[PDB]
Every structure is written in C-alpha cells, then in structure tokens.
C-alpha cells in the first residue's frame, strides 16, 4: 500500500476523463455514437484490467479514502473500492456522458462534479412524472394526426426524437425561474411544426389552415414555405407565477445561416432593455448533427460568442444527433469522435444524453439552464436519438442503409415504455393513460373542422 493508493487516484482520472467513451448513449443498441467500439485500458469493465493498475481481485474490499475532487462519497469520507467503482460507473458510464475536463477553472469543475456525482440528486416527484407523461402524449399524438390527415406531404416530423418538446419546456421553465423574461429561438426544418404547436402555442387552427391547397396570400409579397415563418407569443408559464415572451425567427433553407441573426437580435434586445449582463434575455439554438459539424459559420459564431461588444452572455445549444445526414453515413461526415467538438475550442462543457430515457433528459436540461445563469457561458446539450422514417415522408431509407432500419422496425416508441414504467411503479394507471390520448384527439379534430370552415 506504499504507493497503491496512487493507482486509485489515476483510476478516477479515467472515468472523469474517459467514461463517456463507454457510455450507453445509442438507443438502437448497434452503432456507437462516438464512432469508437474500442474500450480504453484506463476504464475497468472486467476484473482482469485491474492488472493494468497493479491491482488484483483481493484489492476490491480494501477501504480507500476519497479526495476533494470527488463527491461520490456523499456523507461517507471512505469507501471500499468495490463501491467506488460501482458509484463511478453509475456516474459516467450509463445514459449520461459528460465531457468537461478541458476547462481550466477549478470552480466550474467542482460545480459539475457536485451536480453529477452526488448520490440520489436526480430524484423526480410523481407530479413531475405526470407532467412529462402529458407532454410526451401530446408530442406523439400530434404527429400521428398529421400522418392520418396528410399522408403525401413532406412533414419532416420528429418520430424517433419525441423528448425534444419536454426538454425545451423544462429549459424555458427553469430559465423563467431564474429571472428570464424574453427568449429568442432559432431552429432548422426538422420538427418545426411540432414546436410551433406545443412550445410557442401558435393557434392550431392556423397550423391546419396552412396545409389547405385553396390558400391565397392577400399580402403583396412572394411569401415563403410553412417551415420558414416567424411567430411571437407571450404566455404565462404554468409552473412559474411569471409570464414569458417567446420569439421564433424566420430562417431560409440554407443550413445554420440564422445563428448570427439570432445572436444579433438577442444583443439588440439586451441593449435596449438596459441589460448589462444579459440576465433577462436568453437565446436558444437548435442544430442537426450533420450540419453542426460541416458548416463554417458555426466556427465563426462560436468565436463571436465571447468578444466584448458582441457577447450575449451565454447561449444554450441543443443538437439533435440522430446519427444520419440525408443519406450519408456519419463516418464520412466528420473527422472527430462527436459532432459537438467545435464547442471544445471555447471551453464549453458538453452533456450527451440517451434520448430513450426521458428522466435523464429532464435533469440534463435543468442543469444546463442553471449553468447558463450561474456562469454566463455557452453550454451544449446533445440528444442521441434515431430517425424512424426517411428524410422526407416519401424517401426510401432501405436502399442506402439496410441493416440500421431493420433494427429500427423492431424497437418500441419512448411513450409506450415510459407508460408501462409509470404504470408498474403505480404513479399512474391505464384508465388515466387512455383518457389523455382521447382528450388530445377531441381537441385536434374540432380544430380540423374550423380549418375546413
């Protein structure tokens, strides 16, 4: 034991610096999102690799004293290496992978370690589960209805990533708690209508009206497609006692070209309200994995993020990593392990989360919203998911990616498995789950008659 504790020190290094390379982020089961199937010699998945550190099977029960760069112990100041490895594997090698060790500020690292390593922190109330269930039901049934009424159109729906809506709602609610009153958003094609209907409560009747073939524009202008239009709406938050204004900026089809426009608008709003550190105005941006890692303007925007007279004091980026471009394998789309590696040039932490477990998505979104208020820096949230249909509702995915979609056809939607988990725990009962699906279907149908009128 003269210098065996040293190994344990190095042991912790591995996890905090490499655990995310062995986390279970993919929902399908095949396809490693990090493009690496290899397991690092640092991480101990099998007991044999204890020999890498000069340890054998007899060392597991010995009791070790933890340092101040770990919060796994909680009340305890010492632990068996058995329990140490167990806690560390839960902390970084599961449904959440944290990439944060490149920053050189100790107070920012201690904050992250406390948020993610302490035991039992991620605990959700039954009411929070109920709200999440309702939001998931709404997000799923809206796309179901769109399929039933307009089969031929190119909806660009969010099947495969239905946890985006509750994530955005959680981010906005936590920000409203922290004093924000005005939010500006920019977003690509994928999932625009669902957000226009369930986050910025645009009147559903106009959403349906846009689909009508017999539509004229009485304005004297060329006009734009349904996925390029701006919506401004102020609504009282349910959870908070305060109101919030939500703005969505109209963008062209060129990808990621509306990021600096959103930054400029945020800066102007902060300036006019007499805000010196952007505490009451916030920005949120949505990206796709293929565009976020191949366009040059992302680099320039990230560099603009911090210069004085251009800084807006923090942005929350959300990347929808569905592991495919148009028909392009992610292996031939980038030269880095993850699409979110430009964020490493400005020292912004990254949280990857498996979007098949909603109760970790909610916690990650909450933590990111708190970070932006505490430190006024950028933060990136990566949602690993899949794409159920083709790029369009008329693309044929099988011609180019035969094996991946075969697994997709044999996997359950997230709403189902969440419903059975809740029913098993006793939080809810099947009579209650059927009632909500029926209620959302009455609201949708009445609106369709109004659109026909």
Partner 1 sequence: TTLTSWLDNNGKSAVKKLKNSLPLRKELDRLKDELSHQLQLSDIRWQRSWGIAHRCSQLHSLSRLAQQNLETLKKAKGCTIIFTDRSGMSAVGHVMLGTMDVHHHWTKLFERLPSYFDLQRRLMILEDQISYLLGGIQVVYIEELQPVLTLEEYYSLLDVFYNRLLKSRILFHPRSLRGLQMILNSDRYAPSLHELGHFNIPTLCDPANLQWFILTKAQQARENMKRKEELKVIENELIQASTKKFSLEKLYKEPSISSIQMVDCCKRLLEQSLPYLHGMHLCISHFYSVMQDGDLCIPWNW
Partner 2 sequence: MSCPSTGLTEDILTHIGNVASSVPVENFTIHGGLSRILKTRGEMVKNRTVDWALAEYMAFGSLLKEGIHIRLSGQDVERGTFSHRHHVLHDQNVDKRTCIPMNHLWPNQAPYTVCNSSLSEYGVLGFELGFAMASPNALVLWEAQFGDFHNTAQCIIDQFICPGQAKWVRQNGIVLLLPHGMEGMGPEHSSARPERFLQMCNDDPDVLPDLKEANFDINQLYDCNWVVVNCSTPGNFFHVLRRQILLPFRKPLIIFTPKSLLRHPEARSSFDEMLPGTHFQRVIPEDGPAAQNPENVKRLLFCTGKVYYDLTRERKARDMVGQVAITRIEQLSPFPFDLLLKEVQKYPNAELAWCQEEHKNQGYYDYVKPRLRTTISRAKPVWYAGRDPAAAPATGNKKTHLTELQRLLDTAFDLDVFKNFS
Ligand X SMILES: Cc1ncc(C[n+]2csc(CCOP(=O)(O)OP(=O)(O)O)c2C)c(N)n1
Ligand Y SMILES: CC1=C(CCOP(=O)(O)OP(=O)(O)O)SCN1Cc1cnc(C)nc1N
Rounded distance between C-alpha atoms, residue 147 and residue 158, angstroms: 12
Q: Are 338 and 352 in contact (CB under 8 A)?
A: yes
By CB under 8 A, residue 205 contacts partner 1: no
Q: How many CA atoms lie within 13 A of 198 on its CB side?
A: 28
- Phi first, then psi: give them for residue 382, nearest 5 degrees: -110, 120
By CB under 8 A, residue 436 contacts a copy of itself: no
Rounded distance between C-alpha atoms, residue 146 and residue 191, angstroms: 12
The stretch near partner 1 (CB under 8 A) out of 233-241, 296-304, 315-323, 353-361 is 233-241
14's enclosing H/E stretch is helix 4-18
Rounded distance between C-alpha atoms, residue 28 and residue 18, angstroms: 22
Q: List the binding residues for Mg(2+).
A: 289, 322, 324
Rounded distance between C-alpha atoms, residue 120 and residue 274, angstroms: 41
- Phi first, then psi: give them for residue 284, nearest 5 degrees: -135, 135
For 383-395, letters b (16+ CB in 10 Å) and e give bbbbbbbbbebee
By CB under 6 A, residue 291 contacts ligand X: yes
By CB under 8 A, residue 327 contacts a copy of itself: no
Q: Are 93 and 43 in contact (CB under 8 A)?
A: yes
Q: List the binding residues for thiamine diphosphate.
A: 190, 289, 322, 324
Distance in Å, CB of 14 to ligand X, minimum:
40
Q: Are 313 and 269 in contact (CB under 8 A)?
A: no
User: Nearer to partner 2 by C-beta: 310 or 433?
Assistant: 310
DSSP, collapsed to helix, strand or coil, labels residue 418 as helix
Residues 6+ apart with CB under 8 A from 439: none
Q: List the binding residues.
A: 21, 34, 36, 190, 289, 322, 324
By CB under 5 A, residue 34 contacts Ca ion: yes
User: Nearer to partner 1 by C-beta: 157 or 314?
Assistant: 314
Nearest to Ca ion by Cβ — which residue?
A: 36
Q: Which of 47, 243, 253, 430 is the binder for ligand Y (CB under 6 A)?
A: 253
By CB under 5 A, residue 26 contacts Mg ion: no
Report the site for partner 1 in 163-192 (rule: CB under 8 A): 178-179
Query: Which of a copy of itself, partner 1, Ca ion, none does residue 308 bind (CB under 5 to 8 Å by kind)?
Result: a copy of itself
By CB under 8 A, residue 315 contacts a copy of itself: no
Nearest to ligand X by Cβ — which residue?
A: 288
Q: Which of 49, 149, 228, 280 is the binder for partner 1 (CB under 8 A)?
A: 280
- Give the x-and-dash track for 280-309 against partner 2 (CB under 8 A): ----------xx-xxxxx--xx-xx--x-x
Residues 6+ apart with CB under 8 A from 89: 15, 19
Distance in Å, CB of 414 to partner 1, minimum:
46
- Bridge partners of 183, per DSSP, are 246, 282
By CB under 6 A, residue 288 contacts ligand Y: yes
The stretch near Ca ion (CB under 5 A) out of 15-23, 79-87, 146-154, 297-305 is 15-23
Q: Which of 16, 70, 315, 322 is the binder for ligand Y (CB under 6 A)?
A: 322
Q: How far is CA 216 from the centre of its chain?
A: 38
Q: How many CA atoms lie within 13 A of 221 on its CB side?
A: 4
Report the site for ligand Y in 324-363 (rule: CB under 6 A): 324-326
Distance in Å, CB of 375 to a copy of itself, minimum:
15
Q: Are 19 and 43 in contact (CB under 8 A)?
A: yes
By CB under 6 A, residue 255 contacts ligand Y: yes
By CB under 8 A, residue 264 contacts partner 1: no
Dihedral sign computed on CA atoms, order 345, 346, 351, 352: negative
Q: Which two tokens stand for residue 403?
A: 């094996």
Query: Which of partner 1, partner 2, Ca ion, none does residue 243 bind (CB under 5 to 8 Å by kind)?
Result: partner 1
By CB under 8 A, residue 392 contacts partner 2: no
Rounded distance between C-alpha atoms, residue 156 and residue 88, angstroms: 39
Q: Which two tokens stand for residue 402?
A: 């035969």
Q: Which of 307, 396, 438, 452 is the binder for a copy of itself (CB under 8 A)?
A: 307
Residues 6+ apart with CB under 8 A from 31: 323, 404
User: Nearer to ligand Y by C-beta: 133 or 285?
Assistant: 285
By CB under 8 A, residue 273 contacts partner 1: yes
By CB under 6 A, residue 288 contacts ligand X: yes
By CB under 5 A, residue 355 contacts Mg ion: no
Report the site for partner 2 in 235-274 (rule: CB under 8 A): 250, 252-255, 257-265, 267-269, 272
By CB under 5 A, residue 322 contacts Mg ion: yes
Closest CA to 376 of 318, 317, 311, 319: 311
Q: Which two tokens stand for residue 307?
A: 């210069």
Enumerate binding residues for partner 2 (CB under 8 A).
Answer: 213-217, 219-225, 228-230, 250, 252-255, 257-265, 267-269, 272, 290-291, 293-297, 300-301, 303-304, 307, 309-310, 325-329, 332-334, 396, 398-403
């Amino acid at each position: 034991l003269v210098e065996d504790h040293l190994a344990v020190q190095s042991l912790i290094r591995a996890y905090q610096i490499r655990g995310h390379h062995v986390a279970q982020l993919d929902p399908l089961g095949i396809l490693d999102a990090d493009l690496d199937s290899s397991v690092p010699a640092d991480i101990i998945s099998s007991t044999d690799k204890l020999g890498f550190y000069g340890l054998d099977e007899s060392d597991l029960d010995k009791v070790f004293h933890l340092p101040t760069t770990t919060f796994i112990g909680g009340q305890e100041s010492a632990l068996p290496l058995r329990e140490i490895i167990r806690r560390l594997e839960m902390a970084y090698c599961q449904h959440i992978g944290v990439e944060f060790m490149f920053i050189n500020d100790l107070e920012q690292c201690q904050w992250i370690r406390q948020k993610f390593e302490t035991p039992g922190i991620m605990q959700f109330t039954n009411e929070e589960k109920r709200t999440l269930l309702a939001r998931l039901v709404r997000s799923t049934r809206f796309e179901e209805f769109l399929q039933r009424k307009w089969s031929s159109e190119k909806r660009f729906g969010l099947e495969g990533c239905e946890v985006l809506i509750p994530a955005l709602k959680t981010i906005i609610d936590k920000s409203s708690e922290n004093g924000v009153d005005y939010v500006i958003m920019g977003m690509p094609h994928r999932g625009r209508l669902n957000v226009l209907a369930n986050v910025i409560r645009k009147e559903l009747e106009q959403i349906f009206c846009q689909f009508d073939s017999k539509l004229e524009a009485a304005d004297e202008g060329s006009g734009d497609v349904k996925y390029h239009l701006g919506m401004y709406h102020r609504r009282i938050n349910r959870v908070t006692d305060r109101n919030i204004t939500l703005s969505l900026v109209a963008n062209p089809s060129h990808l990621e070209a509306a990021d600096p426009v959103v930054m400029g608008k945020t800066k102007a709003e902060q300036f006019y309200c007499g805000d010196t550190e952007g505490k009451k105005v916030m920005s949120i941006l949505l990206h796709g994995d293929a565009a976020f890692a191949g366009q040059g303007i992302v680099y320039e925007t990230f560099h603009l993020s911090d210069l004085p007279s251009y800084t807006t004091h923090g942005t929350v980026h959300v990347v929808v990593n569905n592991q495919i471009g148009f028909t392009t394998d992610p292996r031939m789309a980038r030269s880095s392990p993850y699409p979110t590696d430009v964020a490493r040039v400005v020292n912004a932490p990254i949280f990857h989360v498996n979007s098949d477990d909603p109760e970790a998505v909610m916690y990650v979104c909450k933590v990111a919203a708190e970070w932006r208020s505490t430190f006024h820096k950028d933060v990136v949230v990566d949602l690993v998911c899949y794409r159920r249909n083709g790029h369009n509702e008329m693309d044929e995915p099988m011609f180019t990616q035969p094996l991946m979609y075969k697994q997709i056809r044999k996997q359950k939607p997230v709403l189902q498995k969440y419903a059975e988990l809740l029913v098993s725990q006793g939080v809810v009962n099947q009579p209650e789950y059927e009632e909500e699906i029926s209620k959302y279907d009455k609201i949708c149908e009445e609106a369709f008659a109004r659109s026909k009128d």
